[PDB]
Amino acid sequence: SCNSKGTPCTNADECCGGKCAYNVWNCIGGGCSKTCGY
């Protein structure tokens, strides 16, 4: 059970590829929503 890119998560495990993290310019690390890369 995994997820795909563009999907919200809290850990890399949530991503079949292992790329869980948020990438924003107006969302400093600390209260954001990480997304899948692969």
Curated annotation (Swiss-Prot):
It comes from the Eukaryota. InterPro entries: Spider_insecticidal_peptide. One of its GO terms (biological process) is venom-mediated perturbation of transmission of nerve impulse in another organism. It holds the Pfam family Toxin_21. One of its GO terms (molecular function) is sodium channel regulator activity. Expressed by the venom gland. Its main location: secreted. Negative results: does not modulate the activity of delayed-rectifier, 'A-type' or BKCa potassium channels. The presence of a 'disulfide through disulfide knot' structurally defines this protein as a knottin. This is Mu-cyrtautoxin-As1a.
